[PDB]
Design a protein around this ligand. Structure first.
Ligand SMILES: [Ca+2]
Ligand code: NA
Lengths: 64, 281
């Protein structure tokens, strides 16, 4: 079971969503700015995508 | 009937309750997504919002701050759950919006509010992978001012020999808390590193949720408020102990688990922490 997507760093947020939904169709994807502080609960269904100001992925997406 | 979540028992909070200590008159800031003050199992004493588009700290549009708050201080009554420090004075310091995220300046403004309002304990069930000088300065200032500052270690799991503890937990002035389950096994998501200080229950933790609900959440976010709550119990039994002393009491009385890279000093034990003489069990 794939739970991290390091190959998505530097891709567009669009491609990241498409790829993650192929691997994990029920994923609850939330897009947030990189460099923010976030809650520290672990939600197995969630994948946060942290984006830079250009809307490219700036951190390795993972489940949680 | 009220239920006592397993994690409250696991850290030996009931031993303090039976001695008569429940966190009365200790001010605890939950720096988070707000707290639903209408929940009948919470009493919110005050608070402030640093989130520009969500100005009411007593409205929690995410749910996370309310769950964290109930682990700290859900009321002792005949309903719901029981908090670690059910008489604590609970403050909703809203620095995260509905989506779970906040700007560094919002978190810092919340820490400054906590200092200015004489909070005894801050819980930050929150984090990010980078620090900033201004963030470090805010937590250091809160500690210099006498506040016990507790934060989630992070949910980054392992990464070889690298530390995966996030900020502000990773700062020396902050107690970074990892997560174990009811068997004292480290949760697989729990961050690791020499900055990990102690562990507390963070798997399937039942607590309060907005709109008079309850539910089981997972995370180092869930572990941190067991330790913030423990700090409030300790201070209610020893109101002149400094933050330095509260911190050492919790560190010096843990039940040691595995290697400190993965478990820090082990599971907190607030019964042992709140005695005068401290040792590990
Ligand atoms: Ca209750
Ligand atoms: Na720390």
């Amino acid at each position: 079971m794939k739970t991290e997507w390091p190959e998505l760093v530097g891709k567009s947020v669009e491609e990241a969503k498409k790829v993650i939904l192929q691997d994990k169709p029920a994923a609850q994807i939330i897009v947030l700015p990189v460099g923010t502080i976030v809650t520290m609960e672990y939600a197995i269904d969630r994948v946060r995508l942290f984006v830079d100001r250009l809307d490219n992925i700036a951190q390795v997406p993972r489940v949680g | 009937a009220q239920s006592v979540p397993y994690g409250v028992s696991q850290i030996k909070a009931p031993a303090l309750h039976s001695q008569g200590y429940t966190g009365s008159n200790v001010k605890v800031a939950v720096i988070d997504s707000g707290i639903d003050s209408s929940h009948p199992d919470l009493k919110v004493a005050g608070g402030a919002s640093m989130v520009p588009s969500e100005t009411n700290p007593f409205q929690d549009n995410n749910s996370h701050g309310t769950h964290v708050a109930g682990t700290v201080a859900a009321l002792n009554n005949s309903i719901g759950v029981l908090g670690v420090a059910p008489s604590a004075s609970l403050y909703a310091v809203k620095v995260l919006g509905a989506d779970g995220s906040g700007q560094y300046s919002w978190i810092i403004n919340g820490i400054e509010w906590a200092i200015a309002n004489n909070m005894d304990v801050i819980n930050m069930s929150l984090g990010g992978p980078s620090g900033s000088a201004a963030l470090k300065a805010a937590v250091d200032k809160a500690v210099a001012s006498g506040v016990v500052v507790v934060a989630a270690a992070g949910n980054e799991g392992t990464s070889g020999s690298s530390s995966t503890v996030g900020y502000p937990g990773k700062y020396p002035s902050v107690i970074a808390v990892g997560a174990v389950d009811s068997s004292n096994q480290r949760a697989s998501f729990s961050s690791v590193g020499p900055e990990l200080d102690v562990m507390a229950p963070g798997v399937s933790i039942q607590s309060t949720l907005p709109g008079n609900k309850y539910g089981a959440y997972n995370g180092t976010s869930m572990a941190s408020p067991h330790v913030a709550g423990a700090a409030a119990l300790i201070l209610s039994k020893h109101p002149n102990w400094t933050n330095t002393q509260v911190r050492s009491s919790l560190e010096n009385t843990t039940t040691k688990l595995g290697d400190s890279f993965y478990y820090g000093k082990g599971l907190i034990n607030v019964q042992a922490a709140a005695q005068h003489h401290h040792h590990h069990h």
